[PDB]
Amino acid sequence: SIPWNLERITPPRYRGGSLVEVYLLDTSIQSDHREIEGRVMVTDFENVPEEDASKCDSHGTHLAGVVSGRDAGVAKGASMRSLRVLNCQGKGTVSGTLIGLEFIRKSQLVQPVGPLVVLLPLAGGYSRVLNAACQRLARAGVVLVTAAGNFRDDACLYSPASAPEVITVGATNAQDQPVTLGTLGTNFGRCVDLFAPGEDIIGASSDCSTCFVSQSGTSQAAAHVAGIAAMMLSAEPELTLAELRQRLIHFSAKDVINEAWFPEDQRVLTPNLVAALPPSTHGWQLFCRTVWSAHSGPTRMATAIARCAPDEELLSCSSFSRSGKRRGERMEAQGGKLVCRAHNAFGGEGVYAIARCCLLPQANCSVHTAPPAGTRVHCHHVLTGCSSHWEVEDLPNQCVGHREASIHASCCHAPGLECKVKEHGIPQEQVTVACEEGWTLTGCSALPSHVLGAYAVDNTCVVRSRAVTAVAICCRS
């Protein structure tokens, strides 16, 4: 009798949202439906373009029901407020959405409440102004959850999906596969933070006050994560956006999506995570996440930069190109904060920088660099990461590089922190080495025969080549 989607987000051991408010920017809603009645306030903020009654509030009512609905919702408690930025045909404008986001901020300034979650179950093409407003609203401390988009395409070409400092959500079905339907389906790629149930999702139907309907979409998926987020913020109201994002990733089911459904180049960029509620089991733990940069583009001096959130530390830095035409990567300081910068080679199509960004309070981290000697550097403190770059066209708390390369070690003073280094090598397209359960991968690199790159996937270090050795640095309290 439990809808498949609510079972799917239930963790393997388990035991809301009322201190939290969730804003919905969508179509109009039927606020008297029994799933949500008395839990949703319609603001009657309205900003919509002209067309060109049951149908008008169908989309929004369903999503309001997915988030907080008493029978079929994720966060059955939670309070909601709705803004109308989509007309009866489900069309809105960027300008209308900005006015809506601005309205939320104004409301908050005039009558402050607790943590806010804003669900934006909508998408248009990439918008500089829309992404900036989302970012700006995020730095003010508001959590934003958005739909990846339904075009079976790279979510980075869409807004607010592509917007920095926002949780972007793709859709999976009852078989945990990406939803695909002809030329339509879930978006994917490095701007998607995680997936959630978004096919065949039962919820309030605006046909009648007790009716239910199944709908599908990245909007439905995003709604599960808004509900999950409302619960997490009720239990731990002081979470910053980065702590909330690291928790959503950590408590997700991992490696359950068959990534064959995605285009080849997006498989590596797309997180294989299906959202879940945190368990009853939770004392402090080390959380890390993998952040892919934008592709550097083909310029000879091109750099890709992967950054962490203000309250995270960059513990390691790696890079990857499909050609293997690569000058490696380095950790360099910038505004008093470390970023991961990767360098394109002459004639390369471009490269990605791949940061490992972690929540580590009481950490003092620095970088130790040595120019080309093989080349070696150590933490004279625990080693959390090795990076290496070169300027040539071709070839124990210690990092070792090629004799012609510079080598960079990330070293942290982190009392209460233990780290170990695990190595693995073989004859081979890909070599793999995982930290043990209860350990967190902080760094992933290849021992210095021609490597495309290395990157962390959850707690597994992957090295890609055309005598190769994967090296994982694993830490814990």
Place this chain on the structure above:
Amino acid sequence: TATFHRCAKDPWRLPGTYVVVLKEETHLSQSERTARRLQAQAARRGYLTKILHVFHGLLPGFLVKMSGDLLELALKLPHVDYIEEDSSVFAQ
């Protein structure tokens, strides 16, 4: 240094309405003056304009209904950071 942007997905563009975004520290009083200045310079050129909304709280700037003819003029006003042509969003 002020730049213009419009939606890459051509069917989703909505020409004739523009979001004018001003530099970060611009004050609401300046946004208003800048909008009026645009309307005055436009009127002298024979163009009607309408200020639909003045932004403050997230981004400073304003929303304006006008012919795109005025964009060169608008990009040169004091405080302008960039201008974006409005475009469509859709329920997902």
Place this chain on the structure above:
Amino acid sequence: XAFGXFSFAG
């Protein structure tokens, strides 16, 4: 669907 609205337009 045009464009990915209401359940994949389906």
